[PDB]
């Protein structure tokens, strides 16, 4: 329960799927929703509209916590990543920060081969 | 543009971090000399001052610190 007020809304933004989860300031999660679980499967999982439906399905089931302000973390080069945040300020939230936290290696491990 | 380091005879050291924060971008990355207009000799020793200031925590590697 705990009725927390300010939270963090992480957005995983892979190419094939967009995952949006909502946590608090401390970092432990509250609820999540994906674009593959919103009824979109296959070619339509990589659509910015499917990231919007994943957002409003995650904007519900956190009414139990009562969030009115949250930060936004985006991670990945996805087709969503900005249509998700438009489905949150329209859902009645105060977006204090929007932050890019995508992982960039300062040249570390070897990626796979280019597919032909 | 021009190089103010070539306007004087000074040396770009890592301890003068007041003049280095206008040479990095808003996320800690080094700004290229094709934007700033620094000479290529002073740009090479500027990055050696950025990299030493990053080791001694006078400048951040990323913005997630």
């Amino acid at each position: 329960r705990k009725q927390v007020s300010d939270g963090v809304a992480h957005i995983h933004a892979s190419f094939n799927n967009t995952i949006v989860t909502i946590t608090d300031r401390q970092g432990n999660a509250l609820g999540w929703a994906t674009a593959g679980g919103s009824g979109f499967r296959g070619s339509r999982k990589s659509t910015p509209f499917a990231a919007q439906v994943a957002a409003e399905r995650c904007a519900d089931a956190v009414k139990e916590y009562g969030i009115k302000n949250l930060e936004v973390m985006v991670k990945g080069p996805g087709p969503g990543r900005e249509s998700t945040i438009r489905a949150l300020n329209a859902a009645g939230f105060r977006i204090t920060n929007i932050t890019d936290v995508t992982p960039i290696p300062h040249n570390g491990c070897r990626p796979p081969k280019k597919r032909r | 543009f021009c190089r103010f380091t070539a306007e004087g005879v000074q040396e770009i050291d890592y301890k003068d971090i007041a003049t280095l924060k206008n040479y990095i971008t808003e996320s800690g990355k080094i700004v290229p000399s094709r934007i700033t207009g620094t000479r290529a000799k002073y740009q090479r020793q500027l990055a050696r001052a950025i990299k030493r200031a990053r080791y001694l925590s006078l400048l951040p590697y990323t913005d997630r610190h």
């Binding site: 979109f40 070619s43 339509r44 659509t47 509209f49 499917a50 | -």
Partner: protein, 155 residues
Amino acid sequence: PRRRVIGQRKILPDPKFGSELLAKFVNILMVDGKKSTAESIVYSALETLAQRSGKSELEAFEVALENVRPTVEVKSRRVGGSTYQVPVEVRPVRRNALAMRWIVEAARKRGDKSMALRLANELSDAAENKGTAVKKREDVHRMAEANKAFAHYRW
């Protein structure tokens, strides 16, 4: 076509009522170019609409048409090595013409005895929204709203 935004020509209106919208409607079910045989069926089908609905005749026709006209239409779009059904919003001059074509193709099946009463039964049932003409409109919207994932426009 490639060239030639075509110079559009006009239609002469209906004699009995001052409308070209119903004159467009009589030209659709006019099979093999027989207009007197076409106009006799539609006049016998809308006087039957008045007694079976209570209203006046011509405005009972479009209230069966706003219940059957669509707002979006889905298309096949060729992109990449495949082709999916992207939805597009309909222009209004096609919107009514796509509606009254759906009425006639439902009127040639749904086989009752005469053609005048075959049209007269579902022009009522378009207003009560249980006929098979409205089930064409709702299953078009069922496919377009399922394909809301394809579009660079948000309206």
